[model samples]
Structures are given as C-alpha cells and as structure tokens.
Target chain A: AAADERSRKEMDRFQVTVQLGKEKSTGMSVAIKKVIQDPRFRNRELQIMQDLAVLHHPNIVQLQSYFYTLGERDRRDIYLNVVMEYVPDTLHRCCRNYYRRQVAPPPILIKVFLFQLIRSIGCLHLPSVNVCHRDIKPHNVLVNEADGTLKLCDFGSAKKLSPSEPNVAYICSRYYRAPELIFGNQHYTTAVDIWSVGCIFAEMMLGEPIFRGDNSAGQLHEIVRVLGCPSREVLRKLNPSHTDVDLYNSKGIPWSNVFSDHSLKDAKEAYDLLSALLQYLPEERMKPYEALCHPYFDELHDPATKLPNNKDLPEDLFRFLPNEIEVMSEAQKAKLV
Target chain B: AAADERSRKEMDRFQVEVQLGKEKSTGMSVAIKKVIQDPRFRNRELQIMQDLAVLHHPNIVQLQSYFYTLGERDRRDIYLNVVMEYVPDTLHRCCRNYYRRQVAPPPILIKVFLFQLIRSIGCLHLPSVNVCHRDIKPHNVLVNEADGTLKLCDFGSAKKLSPSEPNVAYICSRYYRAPELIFGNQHYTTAVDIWSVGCIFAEMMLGEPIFRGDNSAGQLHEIVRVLGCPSREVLRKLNPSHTDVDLYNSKGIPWSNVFSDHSLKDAKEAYDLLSALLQYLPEERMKPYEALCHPYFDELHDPATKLPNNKDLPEDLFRFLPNEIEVMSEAQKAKLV
Candidate 1:
C-alpha cells in the first residue's frame, strides 16, 4: 500500500511536470492523452490538427505538427499533439485573480483586450475563408508573457464541413454554446462562436460566465431569462419534436436575474450587445464584423491604435506582471500617456 | 436473335425490380451498375442522397441508404449506391400534360404550392441550423400520389455546411444555380438555396429555366445578364483567383436584357431578393428563415394551411404519371377561377 501511494504521488508529480513543460515549450511541443476516451474524439482531433496546420496567422495559434500512436499494451491509446506558440498566462487567470482584485481592467486595457479579441476573430472570418473556433473561452485565450499580445487558441472542435454536407452535429462547452445549440439545433453557422465572443466580453467585464447553469438545458433557460423567449414560430421550428405544451413563458427571463449582482452602470450597452449575440436565431445575432463596428466599442478605443503590433512599454503599468523581469509599470503607463 | 431478345427483356425486368426494391432493402441495395455512368450524374445522385439524409423533414424525400464499393470493381466502376424515396410524378410531368392544355396553376393553387415550398425551407433553418437545397427546379420537386402533397424531392447538390466552414466550394445546376455559385464562391450559405427557389418560382411562372445556358461559362454570362457585374470586393470574396479583368461588361449583361421577355414586371423585387440570395459574400445573403418571412410571399397563401398534408394527396401521385398526360386542356383553363 505504501508503494502504491508513493507511485500515485509520483504520477501526480509527472502530470504537473508535463503541464509545466507545456507552458514553457517555446517552438513546437506535443500534449499526450489530455482528451477523453472516444474514437470519434481521436478522429476529430487529428482532422482539426491537419486543418490547423494549413491555417497560419499570428493572432491565431499556429499548429506545427501532430501524429497518432497505438500502444503495444492491452490498453489502446491515440497519441495526438499540436505544436502551438505558448502564451505563458491566460487573460482569465490574470483578470479573475489580479485585475478583479484591483478594479476592472481600466477602460484602456479593456479596449486593448477587446481589440485583440475582435481582430483575431475578424482574421478567422476573412473573405475567402472562415474558421469557427467553436471553443472561445478565457481558458483558450492565451496572453503572451513576453509582450501583452493575445492569441486565440484551441481548435479541437473546429469543423471544415461545407454547405453541401449537412448532417454533422458537434456541440461546444455549455457556457459558450450559442442559443441555437441550446435549443437543439445541429446545423448552426459560424455566428455561434460570435455568441461565445460576446460571452467572453461579458466575462471580461464581470469576471464570471455570463449564462452559468448546471447543464445545456439550464444554460438555455438562463439565456431565455436574459434574451426573452423566442417567438412561438421560432420555438416550434427549433424543437419540432416538441408540442405546443412545451412552450415556455413568452416574456422570457429578464436580464436582471443574472446581472443584478454586478455593477455595470454601463451594463445597458453590454446588455444590448449581449442580447444581440445571444439572439435565439443565429442570423439575428450580429456578425463579428458588424459587432466590431458597433457603437458600444465607440468609447473603447480607436481602431488604428488597436491593430496588433509589437511595442515596448516603459517600466510601469503592467498589472499582471509576468515572471519575466521586463515589466511595464505604472510609471511607464504615465510616460506613454 | 431470340436469345438476345430474351436477355434484353430479362435485363429490363431486373432494372425495374432493383428500382422498386430500393425503398425496402435493409442495407444499401442500389448497385453502381444501375446508376447512370456520367460522373457528374453519379455525383449528383450521391449528393442528393447525402443531402436528403441530412435534411430529414417530412416535406423532403427520404434517402434510405448509401454505400461505396471499391477494389472489386474497375476504377471507374467503383461508385456509390444510393437508395431514396421514389416519387412517381414530378411537377414537370404534371405541368407539361395538365397545365400546358390550360392556363398556369390557379393563383390560389400557386400560392399554396409556393407557401409549402417556403415553409419546407423554413424547416431547414430552424434556430441555428440551415439546409441549402441547391437544385430546386420543377423536375426535382414531386407531388405525392396519396394526397397531392408537394415534396422537395431532389437535393442532388444540397449542402448543410455552415458559414463557419467557408473553405468548401460547391457548384450547383445551371439556370437554377445562385449567382454566388456561378461566380465560384468558396464561402456560400443557405442563401444560395433561396436563390435556386427564386429561380424555380420564376420557372413555374414562366415554364422555363430562367437563364438557360449551354455551359458553365454561358451560365455565368446568363447570371451577369440578369444581375449586373458583382462589385469588385464581392467578386474577390467569392473567387479570390478572379480579378476585375475577368468581369464581363456590366452594361452588356443587365437584368433588363435577360428577364426582358418574362412577365415578372417587378423583376426588380425578384432581382432584389435574388441579389440578397445571390450576394457574392455569404455573410450578406438572406437566410432561409428570413427569406420565408420576406414580404414577397405575403398574403399569397398561409404557409401553415397551404403546406401539403402528405397523407391527403392522390395515391397515383407516387406512381409514374406518363409525360403525355401533362398538358392542360382549354376546359382546365376555364376552371382557373
């Protein structure tokens, strides 16, 4: 029993070591057995890796290499790896612990973060091609430790299915799942991810999941509570198997139910923007391009200054100071101003 | 000579049995040899089956099964077998015999049929989902034998690809094909299907493919004739390989020229809807849900009422109705009111 306990601790240490290695790797590194057991998951992971390799962009996490493995032991394992640029910290980890301890990321910082998010999403939806990063939570967003650059990561759930092949169905995380997905839709378009971006935006401001619920069904209820019940016709279209008896209260759950505890004096703008992003109908949701141009961002920042670029800040203003010593301090912030 | 005749008769019988048994067989019973030889035709049939399976709505014909055969057969012989719901009578056959002898369908009947078509499409885009029926010509639509219920039958080039996965390119049938498809768009959406529906609507009104062309280039020319040169940005979005140098003269091919002979006086409304449906940018196209709600079908017929009661149509509607009986008579014309 003592030997077993020691082995277990060793295993735990090994796992931590692997995670640390993942964080530290500079060029390309492989992550092993991080996914749940399922052949479908394996197939999907490999497919996404191949697709990601072809998609090269600075804001988008680059996929360098991937390969599958079969174990000789009785246990069967699929080895898949992605060589992605490492971001030492996540915006979520920093904001939840650091920025929230202080006030919300000051307006300028918020603008900078929002600009990175929007521009990265825009790049994904470039005219000739579009890639829906189905998973777009703070956990998947990485902030460069070296600079403050934000990079969108994780494409495990990304799909390349075209308009002609319609029968595929894959759902993202419940909190980030779009209203259409919540309502039992399987053929949603790219706008679903935009809804996630909206959720990310709300979380950035408030420091929590926007539509927190126990499950997808609960998540939908929270959405309806904020966005109101969809029209009877729209509801019927969504749940064809459902009878009229299943229709929820048409007025829907009010926004106050979720945002009441938070102090968003400017919550109305966020509410309007969220309402559009969380629209029951996908098409009704604002396209990312359109959303970026919305007036809500008018007071946030100028587009010209927000474009992604590498610039050094003075020795002050860095709130979430990285382990790196070249920190931008408040004095540096004053200098830039 | 006698043996050869006997063998020919046997072959004919076998073909009939195979076609009839297709609906009931457990596994993919359709054989590659049975399908037409042309790759384009085979692709169309396979695509139709896949689309039908993805779009399992009541008003749409069902695809029962499919299989891909390999190794055992010659390279060219290796093909897909698709078993689909067999609709005996098509709108083309019905119109050629019954309507040609009379006037067009009574405005009320036309309204009812159009409503059914719109509603069926509405079913495709419920919530976040979208189904693009790329081929919507009269020949592809069927009338039920038992109740005269109209069903969207052939989905030879249908797609369920969402806006998020924009790398997939699909080219649909000529004349009925959307302008975006003609322009070689890699990022088309459900709006392409709506454009096809519009073309079908025009064809039902005028009894001909709206812009009949002998080839793909001719089809593009025909589209340009009906809709002026797409903006440079639009063209670039649809076909990155194309340039302003490739655009045929805008003045040479305008709506006034191609649709000049049609009775659609407000061709502009059709043009507007078509433009919305055929936008080079997938983001700009009208969604099916939005298309169904468009004022174009307003007050024509209530979709809920006009949609076919699949159980009510004539039983013979499922059986082959000879083309000779399609012409409408003078007496039938007199009964239009």
Candidate 2:
C-alpha cells in the first residue's frame, strides 16, 4: 500500500508498506524507492547500499532487500524496487517545521543531529566504503523522531570515487554546491560532501540556506562574497585545466559574522567547524572522522547527555564497528570513545 | 515599604521600594542597597557609582541619588542608602529560573544578555572610567524583563583600579574568583573583572558555576583540571613573585569539551569567548572593548534582530558616549557600528 501519499511526488516514486514474514507474521514498515534501471549502465546506488548493508551502521540507512519490477507497458523495460527502513521525516522537513513555526531549532538538538550525520559520513568515507554521497543535502538525511536519531538516505548520486578518475562536476544541490564543483572540477574529492555538510550546518541554524544563489554563476558569487575570492593557487588546485579563472575580489566575512543570523548567536564552535569544512581548498577541509572528533560534538561524548525530548541519545551513537575502528587514528579513537 | 522582600538578605541589605518624584508624583520602582559606612576607609563604591551617573549608559545601572540613615539599634552607626532604578531579576535568578524549570537558557537570549553584560564592562574599563567591577558575577547583573535589557549593578566590590597600587586579593565570590586573586597577587589589573565575567558566562550556559571548588586552594585545582596546569611562564606573569607553585600535571580539557553540558551543546562561540576571557595570564585575557567588538556579538549589530520576547532590543544599545568612543580604536569603532 502507498502509505503517506504526500511523499510520492513527480520525480520521487517512493511507496511505504508493511511487509510480514510468512512463517512468524513478523511485520515491519518499509519503504520502496523505485527508479528506472538503464540496461546500459550498472546500478551504482544499489551496489553501494547493498555493500553498506553488511556493516549495518546506525547512521547509514539499511538496504533491507531489492527486486526488479518489469514495466506494465513494456516487458523489456525494468524498474528497480529497493526496500529500506522507513524513517518518518527528513532533515529538510525538520528545518521547515522550525521555520514555519517561526522558531529556531534547539541548539542541543542541532548538535545531536549533526553529530550523527557527520559520524555516518565518517563511516562512508572509510577505506572499506570509500563512497561519497555526492548529493548530501538536508533532504537526503532521514530522521526518526522517536529517539531523535538520524539515518543517511538517498544515495542516488553516490560513487566510490578513486583518485584521478574524473567524475561529473554538476552534482550536489545548488545552495550546498562547493566552490570546486562550481569551477567545473571534473576530478573532485570527497571534500564536496564536506562543503555540503558545512552548508547544511549553517542552514539548520539559519533556518535557510547560507549561500542562496539563483543560478550556477550567482552561486559562485554568493560563496565569494562570504568566503572572499579564492586565491590563484586554490583556483589551480580546484580545476587544473580551466584557464579563465576570473573571479570577484573582496575581503571575506569572518565565519562568526557570516552566521550573524539572530537565532544562532552563540554558535561559535559550530562556526569554527564550519570554517574548516567550507574552505576554498579541498585539502584544508576537515575529513569526516576528524569532524566526528571536533569539540563541537563533545556534548555527545558525555554519557549523561540526552536529547531535547528528555530521552537518551541513540544506543548505537558511539558504537564503532571493527572495520570503522581500523581506519581511525589512535588519537581520533581516544576522543571518540 | 519593601516591594520585593525576597531580595533582602543578611549581608545584602537591599530593599525594593516605590518612589514618587516630588514635582510630578511620577511613581517608579527603585532599590536601596544599604551598607554600613566604615570609618577606616572612604566609600569607593559610592564614589564610583556617582561618577558613572553622568554617562547614563543603558547597560550600566543609573544611580539616582543617595542619603545617610542612622541605624535603629544605634544612632551612631551610619548607613549609606544608595537609590537606583529597580530591575525585576538578577542574572543569578535568571540562571536559577531556567535550572528550576530543567531547561537551558535560549542561545539567542544568551548572546543578547552576554553582549550587553560585556558592553557594560567595556564602559567600566574605559580609560575615562578606569574602574574594575571586581565582583562580576550572575548576582551583580540586573535584568529588565520588559525589553530584555541588562543593567550592571552592585558596585560593592568595584574600584578605580590603578597599576602599582596594592589591593586586597580577597575579593569576588568563590566560584567567580580569578587565578591571580587566588595566587595572592595584590597588584592585579582590570583583567580580574574579565575573569569573573568569563565564569558568569560559563555558569549561564552550564546552569551552574564551571569552576566549583569548596575553598580557595581547591578552586585553583578546579581551574587547573579544565585549563590544565598553568605554564611556569603564565604563573610568573599571573603573580610575579609567586613561589612554591607546585601544581598537578595534566592535559587541560578543550573549551569545547569543558562546556560539554547537554543544555548548551551548540554554544561554540560562547565557549570560544569564554576561553579567551578565562586564560591564566591576565595580559592574554581579552580587554573589555576588544570583547565588545568580537564576532561573538555580531548578532547585536544586525538591524533585524529582536529579543526572545518578540520585542525590539533596547533603544540605546548601540549609542556610544563621546568619552566611550574616544578610547575605542578605529577598527573597534568600525565593527561596533
């Protein structure tokens, strides 16, 4: 059955259902995201999600099962049906809730949500995973209100990127697009996701996107106005072959001033983390595991910390798997535990 | 008649009253903070408040007038009754209110309150004023609920601090005490007040004092635990002729981690500002005017900002006295505007 008809839109062909086991009547809610499977290319998102299903990390959404559905009109045309855990809301909806209510999201909740989101990214960026959620925006993140835990969903644009393998630059949403992506860098690193994370972090506090550019060209200008013009060397690193590197000139606003919206006036450490994530050079951006250890998430490390709803945080928030722990440095592991 | 009898206590001989102007019968609330006049020393608090009466800064409490009253038990014991505009609550009470409700202070409100508190300190620390509110704490700040404005009150421990003039180190409250004062440094500067301000800032976010110690020696240990042991150079600078500085060795917690209370998980900028103010070396502490211009207070400069009560911020929040403007650097002035 198509539960929650509101979620089914033109581009999004998602249907929620309750599946039961024939033996024990073990019924559970699940969502099926349907997409057309092109015979020319393999299904990358399916492959990535299936591989991630093994570790079953709390932050990364699980790919419960999958099956191919033939189109009614044409038997040759295949439609992929990927069944996954059902999450009630999106981070985008959560942000909109606070916005419509004309209230800022609680600061502690912001910390809890962002920490889980980044921790999931840390898992994805691991050597075993090596996948990047190229479109890491608020809409791509799923939220469970019961315990206030998050599950990163929507891996449609994900790819296990390798060095020197030129990928498409036209990725990520407009507002969350990184500077390097705007420069048309074909060989971008996972830092693009970091930039998007920075933008989402700012958006949560701001109740809207920080860099609101109407178009691609204007988006770069929006970033430049706040971050100042990227240095010539940074431009070279961002796109080696792009010759016309003419950009605007001005002193960039400080991160503190950049997030000068009234709601998040006390968000200093967040600004510090944001500054690192949204840097002009991808190398300067903080890696996923390092972000998980940043002081901004220190509240989560405290055992006594609870969610805004007066419930304890997710049980598996700090539980690191063997594969996840192998990648972390001793210092990072020390801080995490 | 006492309007708010709850505010009166043993050492604190304060009485809230309704006073009427003789000419217009304009009744307004006023508070009388009465203290016994010591024959050994001149009344420094009264002198400082009288001097500050001229500027009429919105952040600093207005000292309307003063009179001498004879004690009921002994006519010879003269009591100074200093009349000032009555504010409904103390920052201490405000902190307690949220604690009792099991809720955290709103982050935006924290910014508004702290910005006003620091601005008052900036005015006090100006060369023209040159006064040190040695007892900067939650109790000393008054809140006007109507507009969510703050007026720094309680000049009981205040003095016109000067270099080379030895003063008593046994000033300020236990939790809000500075390191130099605990080190028995008689030649302290206005920085002592800045240290107390830092403690109050943290206390507001933590719902209690950050440096909680039973006594003086234990207090130093409390600061050391979080700040780590003060370096030998820093100790020398804190107290030039200190000996037997044998302190425990430990790596100090990061400010982000130190303020890991669940209530204030996203208070990063507040933590950054707190770190700057609570440094071991007095010279390293941010000066009052410098703090006023810090990016932490950028929200106050925004024209669209409002108080949590949905009211406009106090009208004179940005207005600077000519004398106040004279001491600020051009760069500081640029940011302040």
Candidate 3:
C-alpha cells in the first residue's frame, strides 16, 4: 500500500502542467512546460518545437529557449524545461468567458481564430514538417486578444506516423475524437485532426460541444445522432477488422438543422465548411490547404478585410512559407491568397 | 429655337442640387438641397421629412430646417431650400472605391451597412410613418466613415401610399426597380422598396449592378436571365392587367451560382437573405422586421459586436421607437435585439 501511494504521487507529478513565467533578462512573458526526462530518449515534444522554431512559423507557438534541470530530491531524476512565448488567452478560456455571459463568441472572432488554427495545422502537415497533432482541442489553442492572433501549443501527443506503423487510436479528447479513432483504427491519418477542428468550430458557434458523450460508447452515440449511420463501406474503411455494424438506419439531421440555434442561424458558409471537415471517411475530409481556399475563409483572403476592431490582420496570415507553397497542388497554389 | 433654348436653361436651373454647406454659428457641416417650387403645391418631399422629423429616428437623415426663397432673377419664381446634416460618403462611392481597387467590399462591412439600410426601411414602413423611400439604391445611402453610421437620404422620390390612391409605375432606379413596377403595376406597395434594397445588396458584393439593363426590355431580360421565368401566377399578381406573358422556360441561375463569383463564394447566408428579399411576388418578399430577425444580421444583434475598427456600432442601431415595436409581431419582437 505504501509503494502504491508513492507511485500515485509520482504519477501526479508526471502529469503535465504548463505554467506562466517571464524571461529574467528581457522581462518578456513566456510559458514553461517541464517534463520528466529519460536518458535513453530525447523529448519528442521538445524536438518538434525546435524543428518548428527553425522554420519560424507565426501560427505555431515560438520556442524561445529550453534547458535541462535537476530534481532537488534525487540526482537521477532529470527534467526537460521548454520556454515558449506566452499567449495570455486560450481558445477554451475565451469561449468560457462568452459562455458565462450566456452568449456565443462573435462570428468574426470565430473566423479569425479558426483561420489561424487551420493555418497552424497546414504548417504542421506540410511535407517538410510531416507531423500530426494527434490531439487538438480548444484547450490546446492559445490566442492573443490584442489582434486576435492564435498560436497552437501542446505537442505532447503529436507524431510523425510512418505509413506502415500502427498508432494508438485512444487519443484526443472524447468530444473531439474522430469516429475512426473511436472505432479503434490503428492506421489513421491527419484527417483525425481535421475532425477535431470541425468539432471546435461547431462548439464555438453552439456555445457547447456538438458532441458531448460521457464515455467512448456515448461519444459514438452523439456522433451517430447528428451524423446518422456510417455506410458499411465507410465503416470498413474506418476500421478493417472491427465487426460491430449495428447502427440504425437514419437519414440523420441535416447540418443546417444541427446548427439551427439562433446564434448560428446565419452560419451557412461556416456549416458547409464544418460538414466538409467532419466527413465519415478520413480521406474524404477536407485537406488543410483546401480549407484555406474555401469561401468560408474568403473574407480572410481579401486584402481589404480587417479585424472587427479595424486593425490589420496579422502580417504573416497569408505569408505562406516555401514548404507550404511547395506542398500545394498547382490549382491550389493558383487559388491561394 | 430661342424659346426652346431658354426653356432648356430654365429646366437645368430647376433641377435639384444637393450641395455641401456649413452653419456659421455652430461650424457644423450641412447639406443644402434646392428645388423649384410651385405656388399651388406643398412640397411632398418637404412634407415627408417634416413628418419623419417628429419621430427623430437615427437611420433617417435629419432635416435641420427649411425655408422658401425668391429667385434672384424673378420674384414669381420661388425655391425650397432644405438644410440637413452632411455625411461626406455615399454607399455608391464606397462600393466604387473598392471596385476601382479590383476588389469587393468586405462581407462584415456589407452586413453592417445593409443592416442599417434595412433598419431605415423598417422605420419608414411603420404604421405611424407609412412611407416608402421609393428609391432604395446605394446612391441614396449616406454613410459616416468614422463609426460606419448609415443614414437614408434623398426623400425626393419618397411617398405615403394610401390604399385608394395609385402611385406612379415608373419609380426607383432602373437597376433596382421592382418587377411589379416594370410590369406597369401602378398599385405596387412598399415591396418595391425592398427589391431596390436587395439589388443594392447584390451590387455591393458583385462590384457591379446585378441587373444592369440597357433599356426597359433589356432590363427585363437581365432580370429573367438570373431569376428565370416568373411563374404565371406570380406575373398576374405582379400586374393584374398585364397580358403579354412570353417568357422562355428556364431553371434560372441558382442563387448559389448567381453569387459564385470568387468575390462572393461563401456567402450562403447572404444569398439566402437576398433570395428572400428579391422574390417575384411583392407580398412574398421578406418584411423589414423579418429581415431584421434573420441570422444574416445575427452578428449585429450581439452586444459584443462592433465595427471592423473595434468601435461601437451606431448608437441607435437597435433603439426601436415605441411605434416601431408596436408594428412588429410578438415572435419578431422576441427575436429582436
């Protein structure tokens, strides 16, 4: 029992806690996430952040600096500390602020924030980077309200999945996990992340999660309720070995109806984009580049478009890096901002 | 020939000129519109402005005061001089500025200005006012650039239509004239005004008139090109005496396609509201109150919503007068901000 208690204390310490701090020399606000380190393996999150920092992408959180630290209680226990530029607001906190006021976030803010989030994903999936943020939820999205700039954080669950390798399907928050993940698909792609984004989009407008299931089974039930039954072929594509295909026949509620709440009534363009992202087949989902070009985001592409506060959008919003432009098809490049 | 030349000169002098002026005492910029007056008639435009002034509605242009002045050349010739607040910008100028830059106005700007225009119409149509601007094109919309406040101006074509009286069939700008008016329906209602507003809404996004007919017949052709064949029932309702009903069967360009220009790609909610306002049957067109409640204007209703420059919207945007509230249905009242 005493050993078990000690193990539980160690487990509690193992859980990640991102904290706020400031640079001593520059007095610049920053975020610091510390994790236990194993001598045999380099920290993948730190490595990914470093890779991204070298590219200097604006949408991803900037890795200012990192360091190694020693545990006071034991010399054997080492820790990896990462320092990143701090963003005072998270997408989760912003949404909760509006929710507490019994209102949804303004549609323009939603568009601005979501567009940046999508851009970050686009950067991650570029051939040069080839990484998937296996977990994407509002809580992981950091926002700066000054100009409504968004920076994606939390790469703990991210990976560069090799085509032949199997992945753990029990990843991502329950409400935002893609159906294929719930179906236990071991060979999923970045489409899973797109599904998570779609859920966030819906949640921002609806002032609540579109799918709030109490458990894994309940999560599938919520998805089925709005999306109806997935086709047999679709199910097979989602998971080749899974055999429980007892979903009831349903036409499903239309996307428009699902977004029929008064706050979301005029979000037809938003709904169209959401439906495209939350497709049953992973491959059928919209690619990050395709989403960037969608008319739902047409407002962002226009040079004349400005933030609701009349301030210019972030300068790097349309500043596609060479790698990002290289990944696009000719047609996509032609349509890109 | 001498008589004809003199008459032409007189006609040119009689034409109205809306010129900018300033009050010497207050140093406030003002607009002065001068029109030749007949001894036997009270100026209908002047009378309408006087009636509207009592309500002091913010959307309607303010009438500071008016006077009758004798012509310098002839004592018998009298002119009506009206003083009003000056708004340096017009919707036409704003849209043209964007067009010159090879772009369309931002969608949020479209929503902000259009919402105010609709509110102006709603104010005019209330039972207490019972008047129509008769012309609701962009040229008649006055905008203050600072906070994006829009005010309806140019009541020269405005009138109150009594059920028993017949109004002129030839009214409104050619590009924005209602089909019923083109059908020679002298009995047209304020629905004609709604059609003009719809045309302006389309024009703002298209960066050109949606229905720019070279002539009356060409105008009808342009309308038919996108709207397709008006149903026989709709035609008869538009004009009971119209007998020449020759229209080719057409599926009509879908609203989605009509707005398929890259500039307007994701405007699904806007297109939905436009379709509602531009219906063939006058009675079927959306009422100002109904348009007010639409989700297209949902962003305007939120207290947190602001101008693109982060300024608060017009102070009286949602300030409904008691009479305005009295005219709305209970459901509409509930949905109103």
Maximum-lDDT candidate: 3
Model 1: runs farther than 4 Å from truth?
A1-55, A68-78, A99-103, A167-170, A241-247, A250-257, A265-268, A299-337, B1-337
Which ten contiguous residues of candidate 1 chain A have the minimum total lDDT? A316-325
Across residues A117-194, which tens digit of lDDT does each residue of candidate 2 receive? 888888888877898999999988988756989989888888999876888766677788887777666777777888
lDDT on C-alpha atoms for all candidate structures: 0.54, 0.75, 0.77
DockQ values per model: 0.01, 0.00, 0.00
Interface RMSD of 2: 26.9
Q: Give stretches of model 3 more than 4 Å off.
A: A1-16, A241-246, B1-337
Whichever of 2 and 3 has more TM-score, that candidate is 3
**Cα misplacement distance, residue A12 of candidate 2 (Å):** 21
Q: Residue-pair clashes per candidate, as listed?
A: 40, 3, 5
C-alpha RMSD of candidate 3: 29.1
Per-residue lDDT over A229-299 for candidate 3, one digit per residue giving the tens place of the 0 to 100 score: 67778755764433224423345677777766544645778888988998988889998899888888778
Please, what are the lDDT tens digits per residue for candidate 1 over residues B1-337? 1123433343333233534543232332332123434444546456645544664555666765554433343443444445566656776775556446655543334444554565566555443334566667787777643244677765545666666766333346666766566654566666666777767665665556666754343455455555545577765565444433223334434445545544453456555655566554557767654554455555433324332342332222213212211332354223210
**Which number leads on TM-score?**
3
The recovered share of true contacts, given per candidate in order, is 0.00, 0.00, 0.00
